Amino acid sequence: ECISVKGRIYSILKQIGSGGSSKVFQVLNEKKQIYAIKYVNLEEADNQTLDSYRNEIAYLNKLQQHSDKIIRLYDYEITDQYIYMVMECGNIDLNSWLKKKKSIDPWERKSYWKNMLEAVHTIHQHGIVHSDLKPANFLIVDGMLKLIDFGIANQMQPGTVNYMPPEAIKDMSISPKSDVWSLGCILYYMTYGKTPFQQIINQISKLHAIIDPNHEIEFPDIPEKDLQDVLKCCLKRDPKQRISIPELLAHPYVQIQT
Ligand SMILES: COCCNC(=O)/C=C/c1ccc(Nc2cc(N)c(C#N)c(N[C@]34C[C@H]5C[C@H](C[C@H](C5)C3)C4)n2)cc1OCC#N
Q: What's the rounded Cα separation, in Å, for the pair 227 and 182?
A: 16
Helix (H) or strand (E) holding 112: helix 106-125
Q: What's the rounded Cα separation, in Å, for the pair 68 and 70?
A: 5
Helix (H) or strand (E) holding 204: helix 203-211
Nearest C-alpha to atom 35 of ligand 1 is from which residue? 92
| CATH fold for domain 3-91 | Phosphorylase Kinase; domain 1 (3.30.200)
Q: Phi then psi for 121, rounded to 5 degrees?
A: -50, -50
Q: Are 86 and 74 in contact (CB under 8 A)?
A: yes
Residue closest to 51 by CA, chosen among 39, 63, 42: 42
SS3 79: coil
Nearest C-alpha to atom 6 of ligand 1 is from which residue? 16
Q: What's the rounded Cα separation, in Å, for the pair 122 and 118?
A: 6
* Residue 99 near ligand 1, beta carbon < 6 Å: no
* Residue 86 near ligand 1, beta carbon < 6 Å: no
Nearest C-alpha to atom 39 of ligand 1 is from which residue? 91
* Residue 139 near ligand 1, beta carbon < 6 Å: yes
* Residue 17 near ligand 1, beta carbon < 6 Å: yes
Residue closest to 135 by CA, chosen among 167, 85, 100, 170: 100
Q: What's the rounded Cα separation, in Å, for the pair 65 and 83?
A: 22
Q: Are 135 and 184 in contact (CB under 8 A)?
A: no
User: What residues contact residue 127 under an 8 Å CB cut-off, 6+ apart?
Assistant: none
Q: What's the rounded Cα separation, in Å, for the pair 136 and 94?
A: 6
Domains of the chain: which residue ranges? 3-91, 92-258
Q: What's the rounded Cα separation, in Å, for the pair 179 and 1?
A: 39
Q: Are 24 and 15 in contact (CB under 8 A)?
A: yes
Q: Phi then psi for 234, rounded to 5 degrees?
A: -75, -30
* Burial tier of 7 (Cβ tally within 10 Å: 0-12, 13-18, 19+): exposed
Give the catalytic positions in this structure: 132
Residue 189, strand partner residues: none
Q: Are 9 and 3 in contact (CB under 8 A)?
A: yes
* Approach to solving: X-ray
Binding site, by residue number, is 16-24, 38
Q: Give, in order, the Cα–Cα distances in Å from 48 to each of 41, 156, 195, 234.
A: 15, 18, 32, 33
Q: How far is CA 139 from the centre of its chain?
A: 8
Q: What's the rounded Cα separation, in Å, for the pair 73 and 61?
A: 7
Residue type, 213: P
Domain 92-258, CATH 1.10.510.10 — does that match?
yes
Q: Which of 16, 53, 57, 70 to mutate to test the pocket of ligand 1 (most atoms within 8 A of CB)?
A: 16
Q: Between the CA atoms of 237, 238, 242 and 245, what dihedral angle is there, to the nearest 10 degrees?
A: 100
* Residue 148 near ligand 1, beta carbon < 6 Å: yes
Residue 2, strand partner residues: 11
Helix (H) or strand (E) holding 10: strand 9-18
